[PDB]
């Protein structure tokens, strides 16, 4: 068989390839930014007062 079976055309094939590459780039950038932010927060919070920062509020505010 052949000549077309749930297939696409080259003009649409290249467009789909470019769209997929762009989406993958955006997703990778977002994931890297999120990971960098998480690492920064972990480095800044691991110094001290890990649970006290929330305990003070749980004691002040309504539990």
């Amino acid at each position: 068989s052949g000549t077309g079976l749930g297939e696409v055309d080259v003009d649409t094939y290249l467009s789909n390839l470019q769209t997929k590459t762009t989406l993958s780039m955006i997703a990778d950038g977002l994931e890297r930014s999120a990971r960098d932010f998480d690492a920064f927060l972990e480095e800044n919070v691991t110094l001290e007062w890990e649970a006290q920062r929330k305990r003070i509020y749980q004691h002040f505010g309504i539990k």
Binding site: I56, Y57, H59, F60, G61, I62, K63
Partner: protein
Amino acid sequence: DTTCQTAAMILLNALVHTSRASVDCPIIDALNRLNFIGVLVDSLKEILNEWASPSQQYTSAKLALLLQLCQTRQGAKYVLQANLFRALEQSGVFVVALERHYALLVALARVVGAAVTARGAHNIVQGRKFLTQHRGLVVHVLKKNAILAQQALEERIEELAEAFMLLITATGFLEYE
């Protein structure tokens, strides 16, 4: 006592209410001389711990009273001098269970909203800090509004969303951008 303090708190609301109908009032003035407004604003701290239940209904009358004093022009003077902005910050407060949660936020928002728009440009400086320091939270409420328990919950969102909106237009946060 649990019932005496509740009835006494609600009683003061009727006194100040009926007195205004009779721009000043001698009842509100007496409360300041007796150091009642001072200790009252101090109790606002740790409100999360206090908040059908007897403790819940008691707090309702408490915040309800403060809301009335912020409606008269003379109340802004005595109320503002109590430094209520720093009292509500230490507490860290900022289907039926959720409805009660918004009921507390509305009560606090109304007291602050009416207080800023009571005196004039002397309190707008504090209102901007409250919205800027707690930005984002109000944005979620203003966008949410935009069976019995459901309607009751949504009703509080409408009041809560409209509460902050009054403070914005009254404080002039749009000019700050």
